[PDB]
């Protein structure tokens with residue numbers, strides 16, 4: 632399975648922080664926002680990843696993250712000229728995807744919880760159908776909404792319904808089989824001028840293979856949409872990290888724990904960073 636991080640958009644609510652740059656370049660506590668969804672693709676076992684952003688921001692992502700080699704993965708880059716919808720990721724990414732399965736994660740989504748790595752690897756290892764991830768939120772009408780029965784079978788999925796049929800938002804992480812490319816090429820813009828991921832997911836519902844993994848109350852799916860929520864998200868990460876000795880979405884750590892790089896390679900990443908706490912964390916990990 633390949634992975635795409637869709638990381639453009641407008642971030643207009645965050646102005647002036649986004650006057651020049653895209654929101655996913657901004658900090659969430661101690662690392663750029665985009666580290667968090669990239670870490671999720673990596674934990675899923677995905678090592679070939681395309682990052683899509685605006686014409687002006689795609690090079691900024693590339694200057695931050697590089698080509699992947701030092702994390703033992705492959706990062707590629709492509710441009711989305713206008714934010715004409717999430718489903719456009721599969722069109723821009725058609726060549727990249729080829730005949731493979733592909734996961735899509737949004738560059739501003741932050742997932743954290745016990746047992747998540749197992750759920751990701753399960754989804755990434757499926758060879759047919761779509762997996763989406765549902766989360767109980769206060770205001771479901773603001774989101775794609777997934778309705779399911781007592782057995783966990785999807786009944787419906789609607790984009791910002793007037794009268795939400797459940798409390799479960801569909802989060803910005805999706806795993807698809809290769810049918811997604813031609814599905815995306817065949818949907819049409821919604822009223823709001825967007826090629827909708829909800830329409831992609833409707834197509835898999837109709838195909839009888841839309842699977843939902845319900846993230847329970849013990850999971851965190853953090854909002855980065857406003858100044859207030861961004862700050863809350865930062866405080867959340869700080870609190871987890873302070874108590875334990877452990878960082879959330881430390882890319883180099885994940886690359887080592889996933890076996891993408893060796894202990895020797897980790898040591899070599901840590902060395903030039905030894906003046907700061909991040910490098911020291913990496914070296915402590917190498918030492919144990």
Ligand SMILES: Cc1cn([C@H]2C[C@H](O)[C@@H](COP(=O)(O)OP(=O)(O)OP(=O)(O)O)O2)c(=O)[nH]c1=O
Nearest residue numbers: 637638639640641642643644714715716738739
């Ligand atoms: C619709 C769309 C979203 N996005 C991404 C960017 C983010 O990672 C995520 C959210 O983007 P948006 O859907 O643009 O929402 P926003 O919160 O960035 O904008 P605003 O504050 O102005 O309401 O989806 C794209 O990259 N391209 C697109 O075509």
Ligand SMILES: Cc1cn([C@H]2C[C@H](O)[C@@H](COP(=O)(O)OP(=O)(O)OP(=O)(O)O)O2)c(=O)[nH]c1=O
Nearest residue numbers: 742743744745746747748878879880884885888
């Ligand atoms: C291993 C690892 C996990 N994570 C994230 C993924 C999940 O959101 C969260 C928990 O990771 P998991 O791998 O799900 O670990 P866990 O809490 O299940 O504990 P264990 O399996 O050790 O009993 O931490 C990182 O950010 N970096 C990492 O190196």
